[PDB]
Amino acid sequence: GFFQLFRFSSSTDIWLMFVGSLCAFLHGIAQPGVLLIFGTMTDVFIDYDVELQELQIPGKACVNNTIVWTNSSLNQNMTNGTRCGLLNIESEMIKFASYYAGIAVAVLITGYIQICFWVIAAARQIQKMRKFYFRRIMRMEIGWFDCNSVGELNTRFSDDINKINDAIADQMALFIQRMTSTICGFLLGFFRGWKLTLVIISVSPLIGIGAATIGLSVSKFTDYELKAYAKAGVVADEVISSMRTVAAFGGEKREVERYEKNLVFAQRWGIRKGIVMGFFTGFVWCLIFLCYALAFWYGSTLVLDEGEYTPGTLVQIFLSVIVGALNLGNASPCLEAFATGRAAATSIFETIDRKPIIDCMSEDGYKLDRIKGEIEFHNVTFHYPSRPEVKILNDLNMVIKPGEMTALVGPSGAGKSTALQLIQRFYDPCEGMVTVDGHDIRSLNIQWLRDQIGIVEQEPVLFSTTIAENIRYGREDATMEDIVQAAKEANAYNFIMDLPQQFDTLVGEGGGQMSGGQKQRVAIARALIRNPKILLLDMATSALDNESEAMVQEVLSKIQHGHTIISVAHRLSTVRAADTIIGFEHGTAVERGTHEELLERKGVYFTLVTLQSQVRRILKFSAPEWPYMLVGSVGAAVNGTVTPLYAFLFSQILGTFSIPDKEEQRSQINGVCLLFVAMGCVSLFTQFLQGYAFAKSGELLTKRLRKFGFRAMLGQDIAWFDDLRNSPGALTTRLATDASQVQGAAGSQIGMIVNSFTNVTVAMIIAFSFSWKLSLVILCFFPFLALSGATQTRMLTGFASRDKQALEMVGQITNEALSNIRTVAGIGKERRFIEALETELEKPFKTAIQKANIYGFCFAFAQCIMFIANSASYRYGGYLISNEGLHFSYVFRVISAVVLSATALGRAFSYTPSYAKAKISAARFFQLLDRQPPISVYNTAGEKWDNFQGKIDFVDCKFTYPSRPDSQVLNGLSVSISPGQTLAFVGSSGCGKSTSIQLLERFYDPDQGKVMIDGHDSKKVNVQFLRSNIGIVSQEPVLFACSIMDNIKYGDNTKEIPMERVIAAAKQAQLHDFVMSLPEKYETNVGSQGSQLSRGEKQRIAIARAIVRDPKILLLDEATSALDTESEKTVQVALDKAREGRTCIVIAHRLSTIQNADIIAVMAQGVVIEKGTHEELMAQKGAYYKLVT
């Protein structure tokens, strides 16, 4: 439901929410209830004006004035009784500035009570929710985490509770205002004008639709639009991910052709936002003005013939229906944010109440003492909750006698530690209970059983605080006198002193991490500090370095003894001196004997050891966009001068109820109400054209800015694609967002400084040409009224982003306590990681109690400054009409021209994608748009005409990675060769041999050591020739998302794409049958959805790709990287057949690749050592001579 969002409401918060919604009702009645004053005011003027104008002439009243000039002072001589000084303006406007500025205190002390009493009363519940959700994540099973992610529960803790801090906080408080000035807006019409506020409310739906889908559509056309781009969003991050290969063949000029074409699906999905949000602010201003035509014309029928309405009753019951139906369509952007909250909190409310299978809590269980540790395995069967079909364990029958070690030898991965996770109960066995010295492990205290065991994981993980209190996390009672004994035993004793400081070191996660074989020496001390009765080590030496490998084995083999240890073996020569080895092949322990017990048999480990123990620019860049920023701007003056002109038509009609002669009004009031229709054919025609041509010009820029962007982003070097500041994660999510913040510097910004420049300076003509004296008073409020329309938005969105940097501190303690949940629940308790959330969840509560009372006073004072502006004015306005000759009609004109052109300064002013975040957003693009790269395809392109003939040479080539400074100098190397021959590098696997031939591809550059072609200076040979006459194949497979032929099509970049080698390269590269063994011929889509062919299958495309070409140098850079013993073998024929015209460098990392091709030059430092052939490495050391050694 919806009133389930308030489920966590306490009693101090259901009372801080009633008086914050009594004073929200009682605010919303002000704005259509202030027209009651304004409608008995434009009538008290107009009776003063009628008598004063009739006082002027001595016409029909020949021998007299009416009662004026001593007829009400004589002996009862009042022939009419009314025309006197009996209406005094002095004594009357002091009585309508009392009222009009007594609302502006009780709309100031109840607009800081409707918004400082809800945003307290929401952020006092989301503290109680977010704290309570996390208390019952940490009690779920382990297997519940195995089917719910950790990077997804970290979004449903911060980005999905903050979607129900909008359906409670102010969008409830700002809705029981905007739906009680509709119930009190329209119904305050039917109180008076029941036959006139029906001929207006019969057009009130057709404004109530249009005011809705202005505010609602901007919050709807974001994700409606953000996904129409992303068809381009893969073609960008395909190539930028696969950048080596597209630049391997030179196919760059036809790789903006897949990004010139495929961009138009958002080139016309953002035009279409310009109409639909620009036409609809015309179709409220075509409907207000035409409603004024139908209210004034039809209303002037009644007010003149019946007399049943008075002229102040007539401007009061349609200015209560306009502001009565503005809010009803301005509460719909506030009722979208309930159905967003109500439908995105059903995940949280389903996690709070599942009541898990195993608590990891204390009370509900059974307690046992003096534990021997008779560990038992009765006949289990066991699925995962992730993969529920595979049977990991089957009828597993084995015992563990207490006091000694016990091994576990699986083949590779059958029951390695899944058998062992049950003894600490991360999973219940579905059949076959297991028992511990009598009583079983189910129906016992989880917080007692998890005290006795002690786990040592595969990979170490350490928590963020001090290493002397990280070991404290097991056995909470222990002190520094007792901590120090375990770090002694677990080899941290020299790591006391070599460490920067003695036992306070934060940098276990904080400053700088230790080595992978070193954190484990902490984790042994963590499990040993608790005085455990069970040790459980599951591949402690799984993946760590060979030095401390043998060092931590000394911790376990030589030192560790005394009680029950259930262990496994990474290598079993360590456990060769132990008690029992109960290894198995599948789910059932078979052997249970020592190594001499399986000398006589085969079993599970004797079988194993037979084979293992052997600013001006943005305009000038948009210079072809001149007709769509001048007919877009002529259409932005002529509806910027509509608001100021309206103040002159509306205040014209209001003086024309005062003229005495009856035929003149019905002629005159029918004249001015005809002008409102003509301002309904204009201010829709030019509110269309101010939202169309400023959104073709903001979309014919950002289409041509992307295509120029991706011609330069493609045509640069590899040396910064691998750079840290711009990786392909950020080099394609820049190009989506930053290309859209660059329309807001040219297109829709000249529709602001000429919208709100003709809006203001035609208002100051009207405001000063009629009475300058009354326009000094009100213009003293022109700063406080325009600038207050856009100072809460710049406050608020700069004050959600100070919550985020107060809540990212919470997103630390979460993510270090869900990503490693198997180590939290295994060691002691998670009480510590619950209790360290309440202490960190006060801190985003103190910056949402300071979004109460600085979003009170920027919202109360943003709303009583236009009710005090109508009180300093008309107080002084009454001073003018009485003793000066400023007649009545000019006071509604001076005031409606500098309030309507003050709000529509700011209201227009917040339609700006901010100019400061475009110039700092365009400047991060022009440097890309004109960068000078060190080597380039778009450079001097005429140094060629050398037929290669395989005389390619090295002379002592040094090399660096300038983007990854691991070393500083790779050693020089000098190799020359003859055509049709092989260099055949084998040697250093780390930056030694593949890198020294990926250098030969012009991807990186020689640090020194000039290479040659035919005595040529290779940097003075252009890349378009040189990169054409070669051909590579990648180590790892990476192709496109196209079909089979479309990558063999891709084998040339400029040349005539062959169909005659489609037949030949299929049979030359071993795939002429595999292209036929598929059910289809060409439609085998290789990346998108069709076939997830294996690495041995997928490479067979790639050898076929370059073999269509006619190159001089082959680059067989580490193929046959698959262990698939026939797919590895079959592809070897492809590398061996492609010869005879190929000056190759085929590496032969393994023995199966050919060794008798030619010489070997490289070695461990990248030095030309042992230059001779295969038959010369027998005297000295060799690679084959090392693997036999």
Ligand SMILES: C[C@H](CCC(=O)NCCS(=O)(=O)O)[C@H]1CC[C@H]2[C@@H]3[C@H](O)C[C@@H]4C[C@H](O)CC[C@]4(C)[C@H]3C[C@H](O)[C@]12C
């Ligand atoms: C006079 C109306 C409400 C009065 C008001 O603002 N109340 C508080 C101060 S006081 O009581 O007028 O003293 C205002 C409120 C909203 C206004 C409308 C909105 O601003 C929308 C457009 C704006 C255009 O510039 C003019 C037509 C118009 C359709 C406006 C006509 C008129 O000025 C309205 C209907």
